[PDB]
Amino acid sequence: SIEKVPILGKETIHVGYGIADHIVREVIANLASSTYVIVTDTNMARTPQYSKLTDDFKTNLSEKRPESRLLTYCVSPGENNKNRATKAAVEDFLLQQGCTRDTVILAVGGGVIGDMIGFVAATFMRGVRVVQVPTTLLAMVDSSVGGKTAIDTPLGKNFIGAFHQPEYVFCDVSFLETLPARQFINGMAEVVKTAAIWNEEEFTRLENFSKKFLSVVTSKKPDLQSIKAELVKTVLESVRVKAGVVSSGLRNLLNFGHTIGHAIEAVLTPEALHGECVSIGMIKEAELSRYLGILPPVAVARLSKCLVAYGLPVSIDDKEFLKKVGPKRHYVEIDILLKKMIRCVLLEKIGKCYQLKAHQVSKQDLSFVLTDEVLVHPFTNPPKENIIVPPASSATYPLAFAAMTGTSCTIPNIGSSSLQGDAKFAVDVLKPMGCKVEQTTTSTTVTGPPRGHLKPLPHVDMEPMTDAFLTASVVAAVAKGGSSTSITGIANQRVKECNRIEAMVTELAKFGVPANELPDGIEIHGIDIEDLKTPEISKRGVSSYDDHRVAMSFSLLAGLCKEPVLILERSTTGKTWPGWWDILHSKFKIELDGYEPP
């Protein structure tokens, strides 16, 4: 019943439930000492589990080592006690009880004890032995394993410290009974970190243990005996990940969500905890790897499912999280978060990092996932052939991108076979303006005219193409000429989420293209690719009216200007194609910047 983990080739991380009877036997038999010190905090000093540990200690030391002492110190509670005062206070307590280099300091406590009393044990008598007894969940997973000790200067957190390996780490998970429910959700994010970088088989069990975990811990009294045998291996495989990484460039893989998370934690410092900034940072670095085309969109979501099923947040604007921060939230700008930071762990799939290393990402791609608006640079250098897979009404978007640029885009899921009517967009509304269509039975491809030689369809009616229209209006903007592009049969596009017809005639007028509202549709006139294509983003850029189709249609017209066009409400695409902007940067090589209003 003692799950041991080998760190640096030594199984010294003992993990088990209710092992306080075993801790006392093992440490006074192997670690020989005339002096044993148990340093705690005041919260654990009044607990039944710790009075169990000291009482058993003296009634085991009196038998096996009858010329030894047990000393006991109690640090005042708080994370603000991890300073130079308490390190100097407990170091003076050991210099007045006559402690020597043989002493064994049992640092009973969470992360504030396990980092400070390990640092005390590293500097006392040029270094003595320390045995961590972690009593919080975040201490058992990350803080105790590794031997990283530090205290907190006023000018900076975790700066003055030392590397000091513990002789033994006894993660007794029966100490989790007095832990708060918010100190329990906090430490679980350092378990989802180690299952999303190393062990996908652990990540799958962390989905079935979701509401069988959270309903037990957020109860009247947390009876964790109901989840006794299951919670001892949440901590066990989280240590097997960390111990093997600190044993073997690989050690930066445990810093996933600690690049965006340490920026968020440095501006929401006492209110939001560590795991409630790591979990928000893990869901913003999984998006940085999707924007760079390394992670699939499915993983951004399957990582999001596990954090939200644990209480942990996946946005800084989550309403269960905004109550905790409150008035400290308004200091989260991308001007200050990019100064708090750029190496970051880009995931490849759930349970594996890309090339097993941290990658150098720019300040521009980080300025995109941390925002909600987008600057679309012009379409200077697209690849001339591109096979895009949309998850038909999303396929028309890169097909229209090959109509305006005049390149080639093959959507290979659908042909002239499709039951969905939105897949007809190649053969009837892009072929009139001179695009080579080669619609087969499986693929669908356009090849537009070379940069501007579009001719305006006089009149099309869209009886299958109800939500396939706004992308037909942005390709009608480029074709100048007397032929007035007019579309009818757009009757259902009035009530869905915004009246799209008024949405087009308001925003196309910002582009400098003449348009007006036909009684059942739109009348795009069309203007030359560049001559009159300049919006007024300085005042207010193109609003997408909280619709996914407006945000993606006006990103296609934005690349024919010569200065970048701002499209407000970027994240409204999350219900049809949440990574449309990832395709423009990765699959199309169009540079995208983000923007916050000043």
Question: Could you give the residue numbers annotated as active site?
Answer: 262
Which of 575, 567, 511, 577 is CA-nearest to residue 368?
A: 567
221 labelled ligand-binding: no
Q: Considering the complex, what minimum distance in angstroms separates the CB of residue 542 from a copy of itself?
A: 41
- For residues 199 and 457, what is the distance between their CA atoms, to the nearest angstrom? 55
192 labelled ligand-binding: yes
Burial of 488 (0-12, 13-18, 19+ CB in 10 A): middle
Q: Where does this chain touch a copy of itself (CB under 8 A) — which range of 124-132, 341-349, 462-470, 522-530?
A: 124-132
| Strand 156-163 to 69-75 pairing | unpaired
Binds a copy of itself (CB under 8 A): choice among 76, 153, 218, 417: 153
Q: Where does this chain touch a copy of itself (CB under 8 A) — which range of 66-74, 122-130, 203-211, 560-568?
A: 122-130
Report which DSSP code applies to 303.
H
237 labelled ligand-binding: no
Report which DSSP code applies to 197.
T
516 labelled ligand-binding: no
Binds a copy of itself (CB under 8 A): choice among 148, 240, 262, 424: 148
CA triplet 497, 572, 446: central angle to 5 degrees? 90
Q: Considering the complex, what minimum distance in angstroms separates the CB of residue 343 from a copy of itself?
A: 14
Q: Residue 339, interface with a copy of itself (CB under 8 A)?
A: no
Q: Residue 574, interface with a copy of itself (CB under 8 A)?
A: no
Looking at residue 191, its amino acid is V
Q: Which residues of 209-227 are buried (b: 16+ CB within 10 A; e: fewer)?
A: beeebbebbeeeebebeeb
Residues 486, 566: contact at Cβ < 8 Å?
A: no
Tokens (6 digits) for 357? 């290393």
Nearer to a copy of itself, 119 or 203 (CB): 119
- For residues 36 and 574, what is the distance between their CA atoms, to the nearest angstrom? 58
274 labelled ligand-binding: yes
Q: Considering the complex, what minimum distance in angstroms separates the CB of residue 161 from a copy of itself?
A: 5
Per-residue mark of binding to a copy of itself, 160-199 (x: CB under 8 A): xxxx------------------------------------
Nearer to a copy of itself, 254 or 369 (CB): 254
Nearer to a copy of itself, 159 or 331 (CB): 159
Helix (H) or strand (E) holding 56: helix 48-64
- For residues 451 and 453, what is the distance between their CA atoms, to the nearest angstrom? 6
Nearer to a copy of itself, 161 or 464 (CB): 161
Nearer to a copy of itself, 46 or 84 (CB): 84
Binds a copy of itself (CB under 8 A): choice among 20, 122, 145, 472: 122
Q: Where does this chain touch a copy of itself (CB under 8 A) — which range of 23-31, 152-160, 245-253, 297-305?
A: 152-160
- For residues 94 and 91, what is the distance between their CA atoms, to the nearest angstrom? 5
Tokens (6 digits) for 493? 């596009």
Q: Where does this chain touch a copy of itself (CB under 8 A) — which range of 154-162, 212-220, 305-313, 444-452?
A: 154-162
190 labelled ligand-binding: yes
| Strand 408-411 to 385-386 pairing | parallel
Residues 131, 105: contact at Cβ < 8 Å?
A: yes
Q: Considering the complex, what minimum distance in angstroms separates the CB of residue 124 from a copy of itself?
A: 6
Nearer to a copy of itself, 158 or 420 (CB): 158
Q: Residue 124, interface with a copy of itself (CB under 8 A)?
A: yes
Burial of 235 (0-12, 13-18, 19+ CB in 10 A): buried
548 labelled ligand-binding: no
91 labelled ligand-binding: no
593 labelled ligand-binding: no
Binds a copy of itself (CB under 8 A): choice among 48, 66, 156, 597: 156
Which of 240, 206, 347, 226 is CA-nearest to residue 289?
A: 347
- For residues 554 and 559, what is the distance between their CA atoms, to the nearest angstrom? 9
- Name the phi and psi angles at 563, rounded to 5: -130, 145
- For residues 321 and 195, what is the distance between their CA atoms, to the nearest angstrom? 24
- For residues 216 and 487, what is the distance between their CA atoms, to the nearest angstrom? 58
Nearer to a copy of itself, 163 or 331 (CB): 163
Q: Considering the complex, what minimum distance in angstroms separates the CB of residue 283 from a copy of itself?
A: 29
Residues 257, 281: contact at Cβ < 8 Å?
A: yes
Span 245-304, contacts to a copy of itself by CB under 8 A: none
Q: Considering the complex, what minimum distance in angstroms separates the CB of residue 266 from a copy of itself?
A: 15
Number of residues that bind a copy of itself (CB under 8 A): 24
Q: Where does this chain touch a copy of itself (CB under 8 A) — which range of 20-28, 150-158, 194-202, 453-461?
A: 150-158
Cβ-based neighbours of 131, under 8 Å, separated by 6 or more: 27, 31, 104, 105, 106, 107, 166, 167, 168, 169, 170
Binds a copy of itself (CB under 8 A): choice among 70, 71, 125, 216: 125
60 labelled ligand-binding: no
Report which DSSP code applies to 260.
S
Nearer to a copy of itself, 121 or 299 (CB): 121
**Other residues' Cβ atoms within 10 Å of the Cβ of residue 341:** 15
Binds a copy of itself (CB under 8 A): choice among 9, 48, 66, 155: 155
Q: Considering the complex, what minimum distance in angstroms separates the CB of residue 197 from a copy of itself?
A: 23
Span 38-97, contacts to a copy of itself by CB under 8 A: 84, 88, 91-92, 95-96
Which of 470, 514, 515, 516 is CA-nearest to residue 490?
A: 470
Q: Considering the complex, what minimum distance in angstroms separates the CB of residue 162 from a copy of itself?
A: 5
| Strand 129-134 to 104-109 pairing | parallel
163 labelled ligand-binding: no
Per the annotation, binding residues are 41-43, 79-82, 110-112, 115, 126, 135-136, 142, 148, 157-158, 175-178, 186, 190-193, 242, 251-255, 258, 274
Write out the residues near a copy of itself by the rule CB under 8 A: 84, 88, 91-92, 95-96, 122-127, 148-150, 153-156, 159-163
Binding site, annotated residues for NAD(+): 41-43, 79-82, 110-112, 115, 135-136, 157, 175-178, 186
